[PDB]
Amino acid sequence: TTALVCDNGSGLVKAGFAGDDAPRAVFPSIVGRPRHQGVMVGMGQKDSYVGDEAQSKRGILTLKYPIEHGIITNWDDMEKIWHHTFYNELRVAPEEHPTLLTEAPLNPKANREKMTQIMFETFNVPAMYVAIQAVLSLYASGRTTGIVLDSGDGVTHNVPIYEGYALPHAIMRLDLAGRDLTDYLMKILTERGYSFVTTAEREIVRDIKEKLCYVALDFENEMATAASSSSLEKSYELPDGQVITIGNERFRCPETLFQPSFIGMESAGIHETTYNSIMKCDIDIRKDLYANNVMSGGTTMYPGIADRMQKEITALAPSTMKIKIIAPPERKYSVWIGGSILASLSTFQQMWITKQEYDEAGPSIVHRKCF
Amino acid sequence: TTALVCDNGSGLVKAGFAGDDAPRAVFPSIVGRPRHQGVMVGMGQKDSYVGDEAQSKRGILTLKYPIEHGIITNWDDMEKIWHHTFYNELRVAPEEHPTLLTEAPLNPKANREKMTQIMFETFNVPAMYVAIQAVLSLYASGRTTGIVLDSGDGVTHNVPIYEGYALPHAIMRLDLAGRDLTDYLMKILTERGYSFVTTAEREIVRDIKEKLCYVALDFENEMATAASSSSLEKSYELPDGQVITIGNERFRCPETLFQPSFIGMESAGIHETTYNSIMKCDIDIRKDLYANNVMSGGTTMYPGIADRMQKEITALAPSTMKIKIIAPPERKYSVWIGGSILASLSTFQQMWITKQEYDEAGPSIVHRKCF
Amino acid sequence: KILTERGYSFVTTAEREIVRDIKEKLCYVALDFENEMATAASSSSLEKSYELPDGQVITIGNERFRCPETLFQPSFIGMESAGIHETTYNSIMKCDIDIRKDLYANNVMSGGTTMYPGIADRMQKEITALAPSTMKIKIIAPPERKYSVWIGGSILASLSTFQQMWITKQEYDEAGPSIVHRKCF
Amino acid sequence: XXXYXXXXXXXXXXXXXXXXXXXXXXXXXXXXXXXXXXYXXXXXXXXXXXXX
Ligand SMILES: Nc1ncnc2c1ncn2[C@@H]1O[C@H](COP(=O)(O)OP(=O)(O)O)[C@@H](O)[C@H]1O
Numbered sequence: 001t002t003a004l005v006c007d008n009g010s011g012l013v014k015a016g017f018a019g020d021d022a023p024r025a026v027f028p029s030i031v032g033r034p035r036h037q038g039v040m041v042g043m044g045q046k047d048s049y050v051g052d053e054a055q056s057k058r059g060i061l062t063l064k065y066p067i068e069h070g071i072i073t074n075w076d077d078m079e080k081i082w083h084h085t086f087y088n089e090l091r092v093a094p095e096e097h098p099t100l101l102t103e104a105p106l107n108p109k110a111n112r113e114k115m116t117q118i119m120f121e122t123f124n125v126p127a128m129y130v131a132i133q134a135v136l137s138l139y140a141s142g143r144t145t146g147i148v149l150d151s152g153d154g155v156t157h158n159v160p161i162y163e164g165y166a167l168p169h170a171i172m173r174l175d176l177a178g179r180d181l182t183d184y185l186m187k188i189l190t191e192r193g194y195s196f197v198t199t200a201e202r203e204i205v206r207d208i209k210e211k212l213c214y215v216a217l218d219f220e221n222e223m224a225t226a227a228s229s230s231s232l233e234k235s236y237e238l239p240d241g242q243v244i245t246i247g248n249e250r251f252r253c254p255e256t257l258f259q260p261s262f263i264g265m266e267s268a269g270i271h272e273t274t275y276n277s278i279m280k281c282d283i284d285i286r287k288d289l290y291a292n293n294v295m296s297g298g299t300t301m302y303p304g305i306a307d308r309m310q311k312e313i314t315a316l317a318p319s320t321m322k323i324k325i326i327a328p329p330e331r332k333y334s335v336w337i338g339g340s341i342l343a344s345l346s347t348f349q350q351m352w353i354t355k356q357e358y359d360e361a362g363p364s365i366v367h368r369k370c371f
Numbered sequence: 372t373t374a375l376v377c378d379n380g381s382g383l384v385k386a387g388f389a390g391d392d393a394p395r396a397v398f399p400s401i402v403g404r405p406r407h408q409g410v411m412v413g414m415g416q417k418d419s420y421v422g423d424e425a426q427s428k429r430g431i432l433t434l435k436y437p438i439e440h441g442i443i444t445n446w447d448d449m450e451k452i453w454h455h456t457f458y459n460e461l462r463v464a465p466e467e468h469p470t471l472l473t474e475a476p477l478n479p480k481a482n483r484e485k486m487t488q489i490m491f492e493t494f495n496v497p498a499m500y501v502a503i504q505a506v507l508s509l510y511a512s513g514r515t516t517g518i519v520l521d522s523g524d525g526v527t528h529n530v531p532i533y534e535g536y537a538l539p540h541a542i543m544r545l546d547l548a549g550r551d552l553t554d555y556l557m558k559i560l561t562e563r564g565y566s567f568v569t570t571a572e573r574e575i576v577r578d579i580k581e582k583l584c585y586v587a588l589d590f591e592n593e594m595a596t597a598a599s600s601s602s603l604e605k606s607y608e609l610p611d612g613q614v615i616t617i618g619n620e621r622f623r624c625p626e627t628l629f630q631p632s633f634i635g636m637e638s639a640g641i642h643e644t645t646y647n648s649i650m651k652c653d654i655d656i657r658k659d660l661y662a663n664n665v666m667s668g669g670t671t672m673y674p675g676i677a678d679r680m681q682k683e684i685t686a687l688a689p690s691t692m693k694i695k696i697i698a699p700p701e702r703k704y705s706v707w708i709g710g711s712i713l714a715s716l717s718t719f720q721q722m723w724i725t726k727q728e729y730d731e732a733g734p735s736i737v738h739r740k741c742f
Numbered sequence: 743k744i745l746t747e748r749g750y751s752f753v754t755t756a757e758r759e760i761v762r763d764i765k766e767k768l769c770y771v772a773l774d775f776e777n778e779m780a781t782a783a784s785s786s787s788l789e790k791s792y793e794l795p796d797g798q799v800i801t802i803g804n805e806r807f808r809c810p811e812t813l814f815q816p817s818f819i820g821m822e823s824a825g826i827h828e829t830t831y832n833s834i835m836k837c838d839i840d841i842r843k844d845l846y847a848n849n850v851m852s853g854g855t856t857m858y859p860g861i862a863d864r865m866q867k868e869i870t871a872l873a874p875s876t877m878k879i880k881i882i883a884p885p886e887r888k889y890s891v892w893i894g895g896s897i898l899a900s901l902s903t904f905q906q907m908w909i910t911k912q913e914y915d916e917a918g919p920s921i922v923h924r925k926c927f
Numbered sequence: 928x929x930x931y932x933x934x935x936x937x938x939x940x941x942x943x944x945x946x947x948x949x950x951x952x953x954x955x956x957x958x959x960x961x962x963x964x965x966y967x968x969x970x971x972x973x974x975x976x977x978x979x
């Protein structure tokens with residue numbers, strides 16, 4: 001037989017067998033339900049909808065979002081999603097493979113315990129594992145040491161990994177991910193005051209986040225150009241309906257990462273967090289990390305982040321020593337790709353959970369057995 | 372006239388005349404500033420805030436913490452604090468008294484030199500002294516020999532003192548104090564995953580550290596009870612808002628002192644450090660110290676430390692010889708109390724710095740003249 | 743779109759403003775929706791008789807009290823934002839932890855909708871639902887709320903600091919409308 | 928959300944935890960590795976006692 005991996009890194013959800021280059025297909029983890037009396041009697045009433053099916057159907061559906069802050073909000077909804085994904089995309093039965101789970105690090109045990117409990121009981125599945133993002137990120141990026149930044153749909157990360165080991169004290173974990181940024185966007189957008197608030201309306205922004213964003217090289221200087229020029233300003237359509245045209249409101253958005261005033265918090269930002277977390281970690285290693293600096297997924301997609309990051313580190317580093325960062329093309333997929341690699345090696349046969357343990361001891365097994 | 376002593380042992384800050392039993396009042400050495408546009412125009416804008424005033428005002432203020440690792444971070448802020456303390460609590464003018472300063476031992480000269488420079492120049496004050504914690508600890512505890520452990524807000528100490536003399540080689544000095552422990556606490560707390568990070572949020576923990584902590588008698592056995600029972604688990608409110616209820620997460624915290632893995636370092640811990648530092652010191656004295664063993668301040672407040680400490684020493688000592696430890700009630704105040712005693716004796720009139728020397732020679736004077 | 747149930751029916755702007763009077767006179771806040779429906783089945787005291795501003799007497803049932811519930815449930819003209827109260831507690835839970843008690847104490851309402859008798863009570867009922875009951879709750883419902891803003895403006899006008907603060911013609915000469923957005927909130 | 932999130936999160940996140948942590952296994956191993964006084968002094972007493 002053969003081995004199968006779910007990505008539940010948030011945003012669209014990624015699933016695929018070991019050794020395929022890329023997951024078969026991918027789904028937002030939107031969940032949505034009707035909003036109005038069902039008045040075509042000819043229609044079959046289905047009360048819950050998920051995935052691109054919903055993405056089409058959206059308008060009378062209204063959304064629930066089953067993961068806040070990387071924490072999965074409502075289990076039975078997940079179970080709906082999960083079941084759908086297996087049967088509809090995968091045409092797969094729980095017995096068929098070991099299955100591998102993808103976790104925010106340093107987050108409450110409950111997600112571990114219920115996830116495993118459900119999936120061994122509700123699904124019945126040969127072998128289970130839950131793995132921390134950064135490990136995959138290294139394996140895919142193939143440098144045994146490193147530090148990773150990956151700010152997905154969900155909670156945003158700093159982990160230094162040294163070759164072959166964790167520094168769990170070193171690690172920083174942040175709820176700054178693009179969704180909340182986007183919801184700040186609206187509080188921007190009312191300046192131009194084309195204005196709409198609901199969940200689907202919020203996801204419409206996601207497209208603009210694809211298309212229209214780019215990273216500020218320098219904030220002051222950008223403001224000076226903002227006074228000078230309109231090339232900074234670009235014209236974009238409603239997905240249907242109007243043309244819309246957007247100024248500094250594009251570039252201002254990512255700066256939140258550097259300055260989370262605009263929705264206001266203190267953690268001194270991605271880069272200062274990173275250098276802080278470095279200065280926690282010990283002295284000699286540091287050069288390697290100055291060399292090996294790695295980024296991935298949802299926010300990183302933006303053009304230019306790596307450059308201003310390097311500018312920031314050149315601010316904070318003693319300039320004397322080499323600095324560079326890695327910005328691979330495929331970052332948003334990176335995790336599941338690494339998961340595939342993770343699946344490949346026979347050592348997990350030593351390492352998987354088996355049904356037997358789940359019989360003989362509880363969810364408690366995990367927290368010893370896995371990281 | 373009369374003589375006045377500042378405690379700048381970190382945490383709340385303690386100040387009082389010679390011969391009063393306890394300082395008049397005490398202040399955290401928090402410093403904090405605004406975070407948001409000031410939008411009541413009626414309000415007077417003050418840009419910096421300190422003390423219980425801030426402790427009330429906190430929410431829009433954000434904190435700076437002017438002492439790291441017992442090293443005072445930013446001088447002018449200190450000067451703000453210091454000025455406030457004199458005028459607001461003390462109603463005192465710098466001329467009025469000799470003033471006595473309270474120092475982490477074995478730490479960089481700079482704190483000496485600037486502290487004296489400022490306080491003779493910025494304040495103008497009849498006589499100055501800076502004194503090492505352990506001396507006061509003995510005087511208050513009134514046993515001329517000893518070894519002291521006092522792990523305050525700030526950097527954590529071992530000094531054997533023999534009667535009338537220092538063994539500066541003997542001494543061990545550690546950045547393990549309760550603040551950093553508390554910040555580890557959050558990385559615990561996300562297991563239950565009620566989770567908040569900012570400075571004020573971090574200080575909220577301090578209350579729990581008052582209320583909810585107690586010392587592990589035995590770690591394995593405690594885990595066995597943890598499996599058995601919930602009496603280990605207690606229910607506590609938000610300072611306002613929710614009830615919160617906490618398991619082993621309480622007792623696990625102090626173990627860090629015994630095992631600084633959990634935020635990971637090597638120094639083999641309080642007790643093994645102590646016995647190490649003993650085995651440095653010479654052979655005959657040792658029995659006295661086995662008898663005379665003394666502890667104070669912030670961490671020690673916890674019920675039970677002395678007991679497991681004794682358990683540890685009974686591990687490491689040859690059991691043949693007497694062992695005991697002292698655990699006075701008043702330890703957290705102990706230092707300033709001892710300072711009062713220190714102030715009392717006329718010999719400091721022989722011993723104080725005077726303005727004249729500061730005229731005729733620099734800050735350099737101190738480092739000969741004081742310990 | 744309610745009123746056509748009784749089906750005395752007119753649509754134009756002035757006709758719409760005629761309703762405003764009824765909103766003055768005839769409205770009151772639902773204490774409990776289910777229980778009110780039960781009383782609606784029981785009683786006509788819930789129902790009151792009112793004239794056209796000129797012309798007919800008109801007499802109105804639950805159609806009065808049903809109206810404010812929209813604030814609590816904006817289905818009836820349908821939207822999602824979970825309503826005044828749930829919005830409020832949401833926006834609280836955004837804001838930070840320690841302050842909250844004060845706001846639980848200090849809760850303030852004004853103007854057009856608030857005029858209705860009873861809002862504060864059901865609001866408090868709602869907060870007692872959503873709050874941990876353990877902690878004090880109250881709301882303020884001053885008499886003068888509809889005027890409140892201009893009154894406060896008068897106070898705002900009084901203090902000399904705006905002399906520091908006003909825009910002057912000079913700036914408008916020397917820089918554009920742009921001045922405002924820095925200078926004011 | 929007050930219904931949707933809270934129904935799960937208040938209810939279940941009440942009870943969060945039980946384990947004899949593997950991380951604590953790490954701690955135990957490390958402390959064993961770094962009880963210098965235990966290993967070194969046991970070894971030295973053991974050897975040095977024998978004098979021929
Ligand atoms: N074309 C794009 N440009 C920029 N950001 C995008 C694009 N497509 C998706 N994103 C963002 O990337 C994230 C996708 O989820 P993901 O990065 O997988 O999160 P997680 O790390 O939780 O798995 C979301 O924040 C989404 O809005």
Ligand SMILES: Nc1ncnc2c1ncn2[C@@H]1O[C@H](COP(=O)(O)OP(=O)(O)O)[C@@H](O)[C@H]1O
Pocket residue numbers: 379380381382383521522523524525526548549550577580581582668669670672673703
């Ligand atoms: N009730 C309490 N229980 C336990 N610890 C406390 C309590 N109150 C304060 N502390 C801790 O004791 C320390 C107070 O500072 P202090 O001991 O004076 O430090 P220093 O030795 O630098 O003067 C801080 O670490 C504070 O968190």
